[PDB]
Amino acid sequence: AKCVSYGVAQIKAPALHSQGYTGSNVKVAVLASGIDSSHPDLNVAGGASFVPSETNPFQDNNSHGTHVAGTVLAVAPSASLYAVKVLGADGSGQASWIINGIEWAIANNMDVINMSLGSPSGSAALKAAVDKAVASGVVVVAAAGNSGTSGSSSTVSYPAKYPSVIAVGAVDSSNQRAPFSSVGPELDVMAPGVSICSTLPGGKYGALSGTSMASPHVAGAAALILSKHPNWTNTQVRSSLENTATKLGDSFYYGKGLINVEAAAQ
Ligand code: NA
Numbered sequence: 001a002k003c004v005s006y007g008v009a010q011i012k013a014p015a016l017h018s019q020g021y022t023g024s025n026v027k028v029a030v031l032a033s034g035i036d037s038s039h040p041d042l043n044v045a046g047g048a049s050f051v052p053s054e055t056n057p058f059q060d061n062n063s064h065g066t067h068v069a070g071t072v073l074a075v076a077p078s079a080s081l082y083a084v085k086v087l088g089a090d091g092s093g094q095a096s097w098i099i100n101g102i103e104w105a106i107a108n109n110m111d112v113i114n115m116s117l118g119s120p121s122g123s124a125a126l127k128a129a130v131d132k133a134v135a136s137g138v139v140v141v142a143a144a145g146n147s148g149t150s151g152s153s154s155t156v157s158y159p160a161k162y163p164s165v166i167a168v169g170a171v172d173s174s175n176q177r178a179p180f181s182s183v184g185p186e187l188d189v190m191a192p193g194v195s196i197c198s199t200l201p202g203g204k205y206g207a208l209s210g211t212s213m214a215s216p217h218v219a220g221a222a223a224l225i226l227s228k229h230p231n232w233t234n235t236q237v238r239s240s241l242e243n244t245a246t247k248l249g250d251s252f253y254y255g256k257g258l259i260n261v262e263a264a265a266q
Contacts (some may be wrong), residue, residue, distance in 0.1 A: 001074035002041050003205040006173050007192030011217050013075045015159070015262035016224045023076025023223030025230070028112045029105040030072065030219075031098065032065030033091060034058065035083035042069055048104050049082030050097040055175050056090050060201050061089035067208050068116045068216045070199030075220025075261075078227070082110065087117055095123055098154045098159075102129040106136050111226055114219035115142040115165075118157025118182075118213030134164040139222045139234045143211035144169040145182030154184025157211075166238055169255060170194060170214040175246075177253050181211055187255040189245050191217035223262040228265045240253040240264040 001010070008014065016022075027045070037044040037058035047057035056211040058068045060083075069081050086101040087093035098117065105113050113133060133140050144167045160167035160182075167186050170178040170193025177183075178194050193214030195207040218241065225237050232240070244263035245249030 003197040005197045010192050011259050012262035021227045022078040023227045024078040026079050026111045026223040026226045028079045029082045029084050029110040030069050031084045031086050031101045031115045033062030033087045034060035034065045034085040035069040036060045036066040037150050041199050044083050046129040049085035050100040051088050057083040057085040063200050070219045071216035076223035079223040099129045112139045112219050112222045116143045116215045122158030128161045131164045139214040141166045141219045143215040146180040147182045155182040156184045156186040168215045168218045170211045183253050189255045190258050225265050
């Protein structure tokens, strides 16, 4: 990655890099607003658009899909990225478009799905799609949501709210929960999500905050783990991440804590 970001070090990715593991031969689908494939710092292996008004998955007129793509690569430099456009420029997308993208990712044998997206409601069909992906052996990772807190109520977004998905909240560089990071019993793990510097459309770079920034740290971690243990099932990869996370506080706000890819990759 050309832009320096603390988040890579924080999850202990450099430890795997030093072991020689960089996520080689792992297919990661980035379900977002597209990826700017013209960016010098990004290679994209394939993709598809399901947004009828924005037909090109290899451009990104929102900027977050490109940023998320770069974070996956910062953490797993050798991962193969696929641009699955399911959100438009304003960062919103119809429920069915997201399901179409999940079905594409399954049919094209993705190893990891990163969904840096989240709505206040899901659907039986959306749950069925992520459940199908998991059943098919895909590691499914999603941003927990940027809806802050609501007393004792869960504020975790969909599809992160579904048990089959790894719901990722955001911490800052001191492991403090970000004020916007969604909370609830469905929250699984945390990753760096405040002022993360990554790639932006038009060969640019910049810091962004959000659980959509936290999520690709975990998607990239799964790619590192798979490169060390390509025989591990999604079940084993998920278990390794949750079981070896660094405890940060109450699981309502923190899940199991901060991912530690060094520990996870045993
Ligand atoms: Na979950």
